[PDB]
Amino acid sequence: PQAKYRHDYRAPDYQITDIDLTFDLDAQKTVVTAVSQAVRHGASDAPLRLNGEDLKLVSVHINDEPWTAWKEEEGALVISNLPERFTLKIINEISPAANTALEGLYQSGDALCTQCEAEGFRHITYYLDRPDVLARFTTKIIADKIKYPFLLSNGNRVAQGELENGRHWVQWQDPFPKPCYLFALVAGDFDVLRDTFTTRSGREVALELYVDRGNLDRAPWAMTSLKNSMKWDEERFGLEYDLDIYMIVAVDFFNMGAMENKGLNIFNSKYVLARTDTATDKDYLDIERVIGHEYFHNWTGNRVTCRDWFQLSLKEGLTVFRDQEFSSDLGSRAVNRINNVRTMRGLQFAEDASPMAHPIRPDMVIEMNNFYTLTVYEKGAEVIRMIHTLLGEENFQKGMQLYFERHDGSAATCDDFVQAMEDASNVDLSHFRRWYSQSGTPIVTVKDDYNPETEQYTLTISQRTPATPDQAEKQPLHIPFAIELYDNEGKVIPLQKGGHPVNSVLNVTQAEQTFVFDNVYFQPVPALLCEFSAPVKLEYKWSDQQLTFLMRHARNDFSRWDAAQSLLATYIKLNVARHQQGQPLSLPVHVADAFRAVLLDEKIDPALAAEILTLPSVNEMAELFDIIDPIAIAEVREALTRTLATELADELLAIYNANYQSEYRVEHEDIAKRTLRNACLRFLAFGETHLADVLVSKQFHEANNMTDALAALSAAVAAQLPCRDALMQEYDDKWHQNGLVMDKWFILQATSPAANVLETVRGLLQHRSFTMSNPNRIRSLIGAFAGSNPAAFHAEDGSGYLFLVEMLTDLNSRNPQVASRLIEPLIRLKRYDAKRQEKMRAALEQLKGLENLSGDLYEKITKALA
Ligand code: NA
Ligand code: NA
Ligand code: NA
Ligand code: NA
Ligand SMILES: [Zn+2]
Numbered sequence: 001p002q003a004k005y006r007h008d009y010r011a012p013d014y015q016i017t018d019i020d021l022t023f024d025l026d027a028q029k030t031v032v033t034a035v036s037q038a039v040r041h042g043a044s045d046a047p048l049r050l051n052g053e054d055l056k057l058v059s060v061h062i063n064d065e066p067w068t069a070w071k072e073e074e075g076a077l078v079i080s081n082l083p084e085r086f087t088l089k090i091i092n093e094i095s096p097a098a099n100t101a102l103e104g105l106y107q108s109g110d111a112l113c114t115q116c117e118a119e120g121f122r123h124i125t126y127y128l129d130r131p132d133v134l135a136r137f138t139t140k141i142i143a144d145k146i147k148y149p150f151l152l153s154n155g156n157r158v159a160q161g162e163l164e165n166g167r168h169w170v171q172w173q174d175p176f177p178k179p180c181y182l183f184a185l186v187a188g189d190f191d192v193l194r195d196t197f198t199t200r201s202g203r204e205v206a207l208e209l210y211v212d213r214g215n216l217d218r219a220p221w222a223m224t225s226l227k228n229s230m231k232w233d234e235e236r237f238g239l240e241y242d243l244d245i246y247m248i249v250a251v252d253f254f255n256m257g258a259m260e261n262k263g264l265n266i267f268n269s270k271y272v273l274a275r276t277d278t279a280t281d282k283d284y285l286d287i288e289r290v291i292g293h294e295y296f297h298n299w300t301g302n303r304v305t306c307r308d309w310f311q312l313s314l315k316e317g318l319t320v321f322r323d324q325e326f327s328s329d330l331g332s333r334a335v336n337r338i339n340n341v342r343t344m345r346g347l348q349f350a351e352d353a354s355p356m357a358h359p360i361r362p363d364m365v366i367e368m369n370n371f372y373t374l375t376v377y378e379k380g381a382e383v384i385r386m387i388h389t390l391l392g393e394e395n396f397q398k399g400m401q402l403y404f405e406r407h408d409g410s411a412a413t414c415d416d417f418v419q420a421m422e423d424a425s426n427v428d429l430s431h432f433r434r435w436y437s438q439s440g441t442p443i444v445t446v447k448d449d450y451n452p453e454t455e456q457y458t459l460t461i462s463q464r465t466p467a468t469p470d471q472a473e474k475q476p477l478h479i480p481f482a483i484e485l486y487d488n489e490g491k492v493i494p495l496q497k498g499g500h501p502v503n504s505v506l507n508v509t510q511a512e513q514t515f516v517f518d519n520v521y522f523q524p525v526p527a528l529l530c531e532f533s534a535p536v537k538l539e540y541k542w543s544d545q546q547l548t549f550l551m552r553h554a555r556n557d558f559s560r561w562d563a564a565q566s567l568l569a570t571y572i573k574l575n576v577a578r579h580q581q582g583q584p585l586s587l588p589v590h591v592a593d594a595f596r597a598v599l600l601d602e603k604i605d606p607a608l609a610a611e612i613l614t615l616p617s618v619n620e621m622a623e624l625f626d627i628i629d630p631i632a633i634a635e636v637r638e639a640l641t642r643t644l645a646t647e648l649a650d651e652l653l654a655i656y657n658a659n660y661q662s663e664y665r666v667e668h669e670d671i672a673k674r675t676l677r678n679a680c681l682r683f684l685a686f687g688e689t690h691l692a693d694v695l696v697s698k699q700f701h702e703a704n705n706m707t708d709a710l711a712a713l714s715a716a717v718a719a720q721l722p723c724r725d726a727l728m729q730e731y732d733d734k735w736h737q738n739g740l741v742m743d744k745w746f747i748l749q750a751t752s753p754a755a756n757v758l759e760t761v762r763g764l765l766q767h768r769s770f771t772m773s774n775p776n777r778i779r780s781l782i783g784a785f786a787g788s789n790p791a792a793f794h795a796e797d798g799s800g801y802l803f804l805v806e807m808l809t810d811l812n813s814r815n816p817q818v819a820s821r822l823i824e825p826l827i828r829l830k831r832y833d834a835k836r837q838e839k840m841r842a843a844l845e846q847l848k849g850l851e852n853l854s855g856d857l858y859e860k861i862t863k864a865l866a
Pocket of ligand 1: 015016017133134135
């Protein structure tokens, strides 16, 4: 498989303006007829190359004349000797039942449905399967009426008929030109939740949400979220929906989370179905997030699309920013910000330090499905948020407005987006662009000095981005660096210089730079990189007391949490070294004191309290070290949890009981009390054993919702309490016929601290509720083991590596996309010790050797083994 390069982009030799598809649907053999109106822009001797994969070509016509001047190559149909304008007709055959990779047209349970991003449309017919070719689609679908009563595609339903032999047909017309990655088709039998939304402007939009028969009771929260999404995009961005129907379909078998197909979103059902006894607060808020995300794509993705796949972040970074703003506006801004930063530092930093490291705009791709990443998405969003930080909200919106004005109806580039923001705002983003072309995490170093003679405070800030496997050259970035300075009573000291105030977002543009501030009437405590103003690692020599000060006094809740993280980091690193030398936890008293203070602070927002009392994950902790000792990390996390549970036992139990709520609401104040409560429970599970087993058992049984029942079940697993096995059997017994609920249980099983966890996970491959045919199940069991049980995945004997190789040997042939997702923990070998590398290297070489090795895996394996 050969790599493609962004610098090689060039405009297509042909365009397609309109395509009329007829599908004669059957799960064994589907016949596709595709009539495309085409135009040659290039030279007469340039043939038309149509992408296609796994199609059985039946016929080729040009202006109705059967065509003799064409050849099939690997992945293409190359057609010669064409006129300047003409009607291409292709008839071909495909086979949804065979399609286990879940790419193109395929079978989800009894339904048929599509996935065309990034390059799945070429698995349905021969086409210009590149997102700078935009066309007007009409889609005619013919099928068995009993099997497939509902026949859906993008746009509006314009025609319909009955046929002989119990068949019927429906036709759809989507008036907006689109690249083919945005095509969808769905056939099957569903319950439908129908409702409507009226835009600011008076357009009445039919909303229709399709779910498997029996599941209508778990649809209204999605429906409600869609309406909140539409309303918010109006209020915040001035954007209204542009069609008359908005369809969403929930399918069980889906590689991604969900898909923004124009007017017909297809969703993994984990991001639609909720009921208080099946779904946690996290689930409700994730459904809100993803619904919004796909809805926001209607403009930042669909009405403006990507010129080529190297511009993926132009829609995803931006659309992620939008979902984060949505979720933040409607909920707790601070809790969303905190969580998003945990994700950035805890997972994405890891990716930017891996052999898969890339810029948010990649320069080289082998399999474009490997580039739907933490970097492109999350770091992408942080890049958008930096622009926002530099422009302020008003100029940002002006920029948005210019972007649409210039590019509505076409495919654009990341550079285009940046130029609109610059032009609209008059802020120079030349240097800022480097964020799009450079990979890796910059490290910002801050040294400071107070001068009491002159009442001045000097920050000396420097930056470097270490080399990455992909890029030997790095240069300084335009890094927006937000500060606040606190006096000894916790009041903010006005930033100023030479009698004029200074903006608190510093422009750190050079390798090294000094900032001087006047009228600093007291030696300040700084808050640095406020609200994570740039996606960088901060290096500053805090005292413990500067940090607890900030936890007490900082104006922004994020800063208070962030300070706690820095306080902990220090002692997480201490104790990992202590573990390695056979020593127990050490923790100064004043650290535990700081967390007592949080627990008992009467005025603190419980949303914040809960995050501060949520210890960094094992993945977050791992970014504190160049070489990860996954066993030491896991053990220290536990031991820190044990130590705090004992120091703070009385406090924890009190706060636990005080936040009891008899009523369940999906409401932001209730969620926060409940999140704090369950944080308290977690520590208590690691306390006196009998009281632990009682509290946890009790909650499991008394819970009137899944948030509380799972918090308890999860504590029972994590602390290994006597009630564990019995509680896990109750859950299995009650929930085994429900896959999305069981995923929760598989995740617990996979992430268990128990010594025989791998043996359990292997057996669970035969569990009644598991199946290798479903991505959600694969990920909940196998992926969670590999990815979220590092202590066991990295058992010193190599059993984890071997397990994953076995599973990947399957998935490489069955579903390469899920395979590539699952390989990721193996690609990180250079962060582990030599003996572990050698085993992981060997595992990777074994995979490299597989017969039909997928391009999805090849790209990652070869990068890892360089
Ligand atoms: Na076109
Ligand atoms: Na808010
Ligand atoms: Na200093
Ligand atoms: Na990590
Ligand atoms: Zn997206």
